[PDB]
Write a protein that holds these residues in place. Sequence first.
Motif, PDB file in Angstrom:
ATOM      1  N   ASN A  79      35.954  56.430   8.299  1.00 21.14           N
ATOM      2  CA  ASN A  79      35.654  57.403   9.342  1.00 21.14           C
ATOM      3  C   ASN A  79      34.529  56.884  10.234  1.00 21.14           C
ATOM      4  O   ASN A  79      33.485  57.517  10.392  1.00 21.14           O
ATOM      5  CB  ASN A  79      35.298  58.757   8.732  1.00 21.14           C
ATOM      6  N   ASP A  80      34.740  55.717  10.838  1.00 22.36           N
ATOM      7  CA  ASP A  80      33.763  55.119  11.748  1.00 22.36           C
ATOM      8  C   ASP A  80      34.541  54.422  12.859  1.00 22.36           C
ATOM      9  O   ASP A  80      35.048  53.314  12.668  1.00 22.36           O
ATOM     10  CB  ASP A  80      32.841  54.151  11.016  1.00 22.36           C
ATOM     11  N   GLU A  81      34.626  55.077  14.018  1.00 23.61           N
ATOM     12  CA  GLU A  81      35.386  54.523  15.133  1.00 23.61           C
ATOM     13  C   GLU A  81      34.736  53.259  15.680  1.00 23.61           C
ATOM     14  O   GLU A  81      35.433  52.310  16.062  1.00 23.61           O
ATOM     15  CB  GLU A  81      35.527  55.569  16.240  1.00 23.61           C
ATOM     16  N   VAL A  82      33.403  53.226  15.733  1.00 29.56           N
ATOM     17  CA  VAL A  82      32.719  52.060  16.280  1.00 29.56           C
ATOM     18  C   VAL A  82      32.844  50.875  15.330  1.00 29.56           C
ATOM     19  O   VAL A  82      33.063  49.737  15.761  1.00 29.56           O
ATOM     20  CB  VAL A  82      31.248  52.396  16.581  1.00 29.56           C
ATOM     21  N   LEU A  83      32.720  51.124  14.024  1.00 26.82           N
ATOM     22  CA  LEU A  83      32.848  50.045  13.049  1.00 26.82           C
ATOM     23  C   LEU A  83      34.254  49.457  13.053  1.00 26.82           C
ATOM     24  O   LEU A  83      34.429  48.248  12.863  1.00 26.82           O
ATOM     25  CB  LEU A  83      32.481  50.558  11.659  1.00 26.82           C
ATOM     26  N   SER A  93      35.993  49.075  15.636  1.00 23.06           N
ATOM     27  CA  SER A  93      36.063  48.207  16.808  1.00 23.06           C
ATOM     28  C   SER A  93      35.491  46.826  16.510  1.00 23.06           C
ATOM     29  O   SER A  93      36.026  45.813  16.976  1.00 23.06           O
ATOM     30  CB  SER A  93      35.328  48.853  17.983  1.00 23.06           C
ATOM     31  N   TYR A  94      34.402  46.767  15.739  1.00 19.80           N
ATOM     32  CA  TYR A  94      33.798  45.482  15.399  1.00 19.80           C
ATOM     33  C   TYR A  94      34.725  44.658  14.517  1.00 19.80           C
ATOM     34  O   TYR A  94      34.935  43.463  14.757  1.00 19.80           O
ATOM     35  CB  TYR A  94      32.452  45.697  14.707  1.00 19.80           C
ATOM     36  N   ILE A  95      35.284  45.285  13.479  1.00 11.59           N
ATOM     37  CA  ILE A  95      36.279  44.622  12.643  1.00 11.59           C
ATOM     38  C   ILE A  95      37.483  44.209  13.479  1.00 11.59           C
ATOM     39  O   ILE A  95      38.121  43.184  13.205  1.00 11.59           O
ATOM     40  CB  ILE A  95      36.678  45.550  11.477  1.00 11.59           C
ATOM     41  N   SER A  96      37.794  44.978  14.527  1.00  9.49           N
ATOM     42  CA  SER A  96      38.965  44.693  15.349  1.00  9.49           C
ATOM     43  C   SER A  96      38.844  43.341  16.042  1.00  9.49           C
ATOM     44  O   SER A  96      39.705  42.468  15.886  1.00  9.49           O
ATOM     45  CB  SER A  96      39.171  45.803  16.382  1.00  9.49           C
ATOM     46  N   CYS A  97      37.780  43.157  16.828  1.00 10.48           N
ATOM     47  CA  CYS A  97      37.622  41.917  17.582  1.00 10.48           C
ATOM     48  C   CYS A  97      37.368  40.726  16.666  1.00 10.48           C
ATOM     49  O   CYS A  97      37.725  39.593  17.011  1.00 10.48           O
ATOM     50  CB  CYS A  97      36.486  42.058  18.592  1.00 10.48           C
ATOM     51  N   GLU A 131      23.609  49.170   9.379  1.00 15.02           N
ATOM     52  CA  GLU A 131      23.234  47.766   9.252  1.00 15.02           C
ATOM     53  C   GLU A 131      24.462  46.865   9.238  1.00 15.02           C
ATOM     54  O   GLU A 131      24.366  45.684   9.590  1.00 15.02           O
ATOM     55  CB  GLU A 131      22.400  47.551   7.989  1.00 15.02           C
ATOM     56  N   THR A 132      25.619  47.400   8.832  1.00 19.27           N
ATOM     57  CA  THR A 132      26.862  46.640   8.928  1.00 19.27           C
ATOM     58  C   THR A 132      27.238  46.411  10.383  1.00 19.27           C
ATOM     59  O   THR A 132      27.634  45.303  10.764  1.00 19.27           O
ATOM     60  CB  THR A 132      27.985  47.371   8.188  1.00 19.27           C
ATOM     61  N   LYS A 133      27.107  47.449  11.211  1.00 23.90           N
ATOM     62  CA  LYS A 133      27.321  47.292  12.645  1.00 23.90           C
ATOM     63  C   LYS A 133      26.383  46.240  13.225  1.00 23.90           C
ATOM     64  O   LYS A 133      26.790  45.426  14.063  1.00 23.90           O
ATOM     65  CB  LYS A 133      27.113  48.634  13.345  1.00 23.90           C
ATOM     66  N   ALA A 134      25.122  46.243  12.786  1.00 26.82           N
ATOM     67  CA  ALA A 134      24.159  45.269  13.288  1.00 26.82           C
ATOM     68  C   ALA A 134      24.522  43.860  12.843  1.00 26.82           C
ATOM     69  O   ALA A 134      24.436  42.912  13.632  1.00 26.82           O
ATOM     70  CB  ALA A 134      22.748  45.632  12.823  1.00 26.82           C
TER      71      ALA A 134
END
Lengths: 373, 412, 412, 373
Positions: A125-129, A131-135, A361-364
């Motif tokens: 349940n993290d839309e931004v995360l 996106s990071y895994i996506s690219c 911190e995973t996003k970072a």
Amino acid sequence: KDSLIMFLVEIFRSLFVSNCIDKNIDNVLLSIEEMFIDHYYNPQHSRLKYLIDDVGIFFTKLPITKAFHTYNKKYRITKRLYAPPTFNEVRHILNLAQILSLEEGLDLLTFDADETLYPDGHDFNDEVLASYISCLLKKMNIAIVTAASYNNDAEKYQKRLENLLKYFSKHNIKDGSYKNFYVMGGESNYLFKCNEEATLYSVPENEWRHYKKFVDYDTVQEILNISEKCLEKVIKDFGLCAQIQRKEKSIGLVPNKIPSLNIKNEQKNYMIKYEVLEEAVIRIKKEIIKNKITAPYCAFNGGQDLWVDVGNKAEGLLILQKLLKIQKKKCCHIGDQFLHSGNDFPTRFCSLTLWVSNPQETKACLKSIMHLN
Amino acid sequence: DNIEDIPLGSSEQDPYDFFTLSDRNVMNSDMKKNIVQWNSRYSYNQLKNKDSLIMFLVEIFRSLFVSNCIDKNIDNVLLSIEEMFIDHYYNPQHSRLKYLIDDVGIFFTKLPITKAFHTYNKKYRITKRLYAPPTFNEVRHILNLAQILSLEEGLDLLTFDADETLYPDGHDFNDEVLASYISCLLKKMNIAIVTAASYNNDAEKYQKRLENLLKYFSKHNIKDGSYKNFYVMGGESNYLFKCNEEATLYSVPENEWRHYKKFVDYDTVQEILNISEKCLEKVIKDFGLCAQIQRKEKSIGLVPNKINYMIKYEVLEEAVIRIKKEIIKNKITAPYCAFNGGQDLWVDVGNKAEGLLILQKLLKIQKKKCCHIGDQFLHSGNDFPTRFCSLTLWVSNPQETKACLKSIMHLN
Amino acid sequence: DNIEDIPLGSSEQDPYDFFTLSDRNVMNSDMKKNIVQWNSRYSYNQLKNKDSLIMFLVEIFRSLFVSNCIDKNIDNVLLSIEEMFIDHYYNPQHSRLKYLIDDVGIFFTKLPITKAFHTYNKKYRITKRLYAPPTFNEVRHILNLAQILSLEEGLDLLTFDADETLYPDGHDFNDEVLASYISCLLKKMNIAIVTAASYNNDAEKYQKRLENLLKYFSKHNIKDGSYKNFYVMGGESNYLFKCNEEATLYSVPENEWRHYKKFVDYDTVQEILNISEKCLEKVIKDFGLCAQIQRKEKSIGLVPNKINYMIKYEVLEEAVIRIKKEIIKNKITAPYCAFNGGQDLWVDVGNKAEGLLILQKLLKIQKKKCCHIGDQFLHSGNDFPTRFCSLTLWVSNPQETKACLKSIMHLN
Amino acid sequence: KDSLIMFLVEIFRSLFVSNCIDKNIDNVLLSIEEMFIDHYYNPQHSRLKYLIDDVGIFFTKLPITKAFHTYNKKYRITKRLYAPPTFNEVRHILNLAQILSLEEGLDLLTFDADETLYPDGHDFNDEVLASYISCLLKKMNIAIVTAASYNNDAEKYQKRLENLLKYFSKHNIKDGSYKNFYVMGGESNYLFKCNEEATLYSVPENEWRHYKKFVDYDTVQEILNISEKCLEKVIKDFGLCAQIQRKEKSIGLVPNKIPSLNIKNEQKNYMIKYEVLEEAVIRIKKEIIKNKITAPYCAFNGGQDLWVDVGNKAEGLLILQKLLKIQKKKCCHIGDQFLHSGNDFPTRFCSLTLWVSNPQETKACLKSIMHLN
């Protein structure tokens, strides 16, 4: 704790109390970096091995000095007169250093899904995360190691990762990137890949059976029977309201729901003292060692129920390494070490490891992976 | 007996923490918090500083467990410890227990620690553990049990650290089951609420946080005049409110209770706020923070800006120590509290120990008949001395607060 | 500047020692003493308590060594430490070095710690050690070097803890080579001797211990009137003697120096001795000791009986703490010193810090021009505060005392 | 330090702070004793092994409770209100416990002569201690292990033990007791026995050569050459005034006498910093391990000069055990562990070991050995 972090923390503390932490401290940082690179090369005979016995192996030359200089400009930790660098900050430093070490690049990124991706008890349940895994999925293989034991049923595993798979279908799967995504169930027992329709499917067991060391069906059943006897004894003397649940290659102690302080008509899972769960983990490991079991296994707490599985997440990490024909220097793993206290299954020797206290911190760390290219 | 003679040291600092166990951002769920207490190097010094008496008992039980005798008849050790506790109750100053631990404080009741251990052990069978000794959480439960069982005569005052126990994560009161316990206790005894929030003298703002709780009060308690015993304290010891006929707070006249609080010439109050405001502005400039300063009448705070922008926990600790040092540099003796919240920083010209004593003197209650529900993980020891004002219970979550209040409900 | 405002805490106890490193009976030769300082668990807490500033430098150099950079250009760390030292010299109270270490004391000179490190390292090449970091003994040598090199202007007063440095193992003075250094220093500057021994006002008894030293004084020093600068202090701060024409001590008239010492109503003096005598008698009965109590005018002691019958070191520590606790129980504020010797126990109604200040005020010497030669292993920190009165040098054996005095001899 | 002593010290501390140390504490003492006896039997699987990993092996059932009760009546350590039991006192307790454990008896008593019998730098000079060894010699074999390397010349060894041998000749040798006395030179290289005329004589090397594991003459010469190269490097960079002295199977760094602070005409041995000696010991062990040497050896400080010998005092202890055909349970050793800091040659696993800080405690322990029969 973790002897390496304490090494850097204590050095930074003593540098701070000297009131010189904000000056040019490149001589100390470069000496530590040269010592770290001198443990990269000839690791068994490095000087770091004497100073810290449990360094393990380093698979890349990390630029700890450049990582400190980069991070310090962002947060200005050297400007603080009364608060020296902490355990958390040094962990962030080594995370950035390990990312910067991979100048050539990596091809496998693995996530301990229980710890970083989804918060326990809920799905992705993290839309931004997503996106990071996506690219990042386009450029490298991304594997997910999850401790859930649902046999080889891909629908149950998709229920937890549905939001991320939907993100895959919308933006990733267009240009053949979707082939890189892999998921590992159990610990090293079930493997899943992605298809064109963005739906998980179990890979045939014969394709990857040869890479993993075989564990006899008689031996695993011996392990589960030992664990069942210990858990029964633990429920008996503590008077617990829990029950033993047995899977194909998994066995666990799960609490029973009982009516609680909510008046009249409601339920709550019976709370089992965390101390009782640790006592049970030690008893299970003690009995398994008594019976001289060489097969790899993992007995972990991880919340309110106790679970004993055969194989460890390190075995799944090495399986994906040997299957994808990737050298150990070109693969990293994102996982949290707070949840696994005593370790005995830490992958510090299997692949590069990052420590990330929460999904932010995973996003970072994943933003830094994006900036690396 | 008085805040003037009570030992504060508001401008002292607890020994620095490199592991940042108080960082509730990194620590997240209670699972990760409980892991670190097992490892001694992770949490020892921080722990004992919060309650050294509990740690003193941990060390005794640890040595009892490693002697492989913790499960035999240990009543001789427990009775001896109980005898020291009673001797510290009779003669708290210069007692032998005071010699062992300087910050033990005062005991207001004969502690039956032996019975509390026997009962707690019989319920959970913690002595059966062969590889895990009794942890810090379990002995603090025993001390709670020992203080409840000690309190044999009864209670007249019950006080809650509202920021710690009543509000979930800074939200408003939202626990209807807890309201029933609180309502039944108000019928029998007075209930006082001390909260660090400073909303000037706006009674409606304080009510907004307690709006859900006051609805239950109006439903069941208003019938038997128990609402008069309910009191709320704003700032830290600055503003006092009582309850009227309707479920709405009305301020107690200042002249009624003014003399009980230690006098502050007020000119020093704003000197404190000016020093803090200049330090926080310099901290914001130095670290390039995205935050705003909210100044009240007798309170000032540093609050993160709305997206909430994350402020580094260590910068918050740095700014707290800067403010205390600069306050010393101007030689200000007024009792105040500058504490480090999870996401916010706050400097108040009041202390919750001062407000607790103000409530004691106003209601004319003896210390033996006073109790406090508070979590000792969050509040630093120098700001609020432990067990100096009244009996103190330790609660980590709303569930343990429910259980303690249910046990207090069945008292005698 | 005064003993009244100086911080003593005569009735405090250093944190207990389970390893008994101060037990010079078990520790015997200096080889076994040096072994335990390498192991941190053996000696850490005891050490830092004796001189926390040295330990603070040990930790910095330890982290420098384990970074594998101690042998590179470390002048930035050393210059920063020197800058903190000079900032503590200019503003000792509320300095940042005072914030790091509470018991750092006061600096009376600009410490060139950087040059002291460079010179000490160049002589012994301690930075070349790849597996052994700099130990506590070597940084205390550097601090001695830093204080000698700091003292650029010169000296007027030199003071010796006579029990520690001058007397070998309690015997009389018997070091003729040391006498030459002492004689040459008396020619240039005043020499004061403070000894804890209490022989009432018998000048011949004090001379008997210094008989060998006074023979050298009469041979070479009597020619140029330097003998007038020699002073001896009995008790701890109770009796004062000077030198006459012959090599014999003559007591200074009481009216000449009476006012400098802090007043004690004398009735309290004998109340102290009565409390101590009752405690020691109870200790002898409780442990069945074979010992005798020797009481002086303003001193009392517990001494083993002649065969010497061995008294357990721990019983001596037990009796010292008993006396301090009972003295508190009667609320006695007079400054005194109750210390634990190797074989004897002694309670004196004087303090060597008080006598050092008395000698300073009598000779009208500024603190910058005062120095003290003393071993900080034997004397507890609460009895004699370190570097509060004058510059302090640390010497472990007569050889290091010779070397320090030889270095002081070549000053400027 | 020594993990077992710290175990008992911390227990006694916590018992003291509870203000119950002077009451009936037999439940704690008996539980500790039962745990110690449960490590005597089935040692590898005892519970003590988990609580303390470096317990080693216990060869007798010691009565730690009875030893505490006996010692406490003598010194009244439980009566002290402000001083809990110390490291020294617990060491005395375990000494008395180990003596009391030998109810059946022992036949071999060995002394680390460098540590207990003669004070370093002088010969045997204790008339009372010679009397205790005298009466004990009749009942059991007494062996002396000394680190001095004088080859097999018995006259040099007799110079240090002349007073004790004179005591032997006057009172012991009358009734055939003198045959029991043995002395071991070097570390395990030279052996000496006693004759009717009370004079030391070297035993033939062939008689006891088979018991010791052979060490190649090429290997020992390799060890001494490595040590010579290290000591030369250490003298060079520290600018020391010392020289390397080579014996048959021994090599050491000895300080050179130089004129010192005594005016005009006197000498003093050049003082070498204790820190430099420890640095050299670590360098020598590091180089020897680098060359993969399995032969036993001992590199020790022991005063002001450094010495590297082949073989350890443990080898001489086991030699005398196997030669005299004595089981390990019936032999004890008196030696001081303060002088050997890092150990790596401690005989806690070879025979029973007593810790005695000075010759007076040796008299006390030998008086207890007299009282045992």
